[PDB]
Amino acid sequence: KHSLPDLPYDYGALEPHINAQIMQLHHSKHHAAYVNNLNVTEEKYQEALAKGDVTAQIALQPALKFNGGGHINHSIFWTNLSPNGGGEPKGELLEAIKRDFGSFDKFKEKLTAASVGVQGSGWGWLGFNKERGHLQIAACPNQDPLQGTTGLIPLLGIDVWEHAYYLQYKNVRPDYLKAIWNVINWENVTERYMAC
């Protein structure tokens, strides 16, 4: 059984970059729905697996991926943001970034392009390629989780589903991305990075 994680900060803590209304809806409505559906889906999957119903297991894949991905992605997202975030990373993460992207700004540009370029709903990710030992940028459709579908270890995720910015930035996705850099919790990204 999975559960909706508590937000490490107040809903209005990311003001004015991400308003309180979006944070409240995103967390208490969208994320909550993913968790509940995930639990219901894992429930049905245990039954199908117990009696060897292969057709049932395959029919459930879309729901498990979508809701499981939704839970995974958002849980990471909440920790990637902080009212005390922003600025630039320091230490080994900054070195790894300059080394694989040229500079911190070229990195911002690459991640922003990948996020703005998502056709439809999806996520822009900064991940770690364990096999090659270097950072890597990827985009995922809908709620497809980074690690489960590409093998990359997630470090920083940017949600570009319209519900993550529409109430405040309307259709101007680039304005949303420009603003989110001010609340990125580089301390958390560093932890995830040191862990792998």
Positions in the binding site for a copy of itself (CB under 8 A): 25, 29-30, 33, 62, 66, 119-122, 141-143, 161-163, 166-167, 170-171
Minimum distance between the CB of residue 68 and K ion, rounded to whole angstroms? 10
Judging by DSSP bridges, how do beta strands 122-129 and 134-141 pair with one another? Answer: antiparallel
The helix/strand/coil state of 81 is strand
Task: Choose among Mn ion, a copy of itself, K ion, none what residue 2 binds, the Cβ cut-off being 5 to 8 Å by kind.
Answer: K ion
Specify the residue, 34 or 169, whose C-beta has the smaller distance to K ion.
Answer: 34
Gap between the Cα atoms of 164 and 141, Å rounded? 15
The nearer residue to Mn ion, 74 or 192, going by C-beta atoms, is: 74
- Of 148, 159, 152, 151, the residue nearest 115 (C-alpha): 159
Assess 110 for contact with K ion (CB under 5 A).
Answer: no
Q: Are 25 and 32 in contact (CB under 8 A)?
A: no
Is 159 assigned to a binding site? yes
Q: 159 contacts which partner out of K ion, Mn ion, a copy of itself, none, CB within 5 to 8 A by kind?
A: Mn ion
- Interacting stretch for Mn ion, rule CB under 5 A, among 32-40, 144-152, 153-161, 187-195? 153-161
Q: With respect to a copy of itself, which residue has the nearer C-beta, 60 or 155?
A: 60
Measured CA to CA, the distance from residue 193 to residue 195 in angstroms comes to 5
Asked if residue 74 belongs to a known ligand binding site, the reply is yes
Smaller CB separation from Mn ion, 118 or 164: 164
Instruction: Take residue 84 and report the two structure tokens written for it.
Output: 């005390």
Place of tokens 């057709």: 55
Size of the site for K ion (CB under 5 A): 1
Q: How far is the CB of 146 from a copy of itself (least distance, A)?
A: 16
2 binds K ion (CB under 5 A): yes
Alpha-carbon distance of 45 to 36, in angstroms, equals 14
From the list 18, 155, 159, 165, which residue makes contact with Mn ion (rule: CB under 5 A)? Answer: 159
163 is in an annotated binding site: yes
Secondary structure string (H, E, C) spanning 118-173: CCCCEEEEEEEECCCCEEEEEEEECCCCHHHHHCCEEEEEEECCHHHCHHHHCCCH
Length of the chain, please?
196
Residues within the interface to Mn ion (CB under 5 A): 159, 161, 164
Annotated binding site: 26, 74, 159, 163
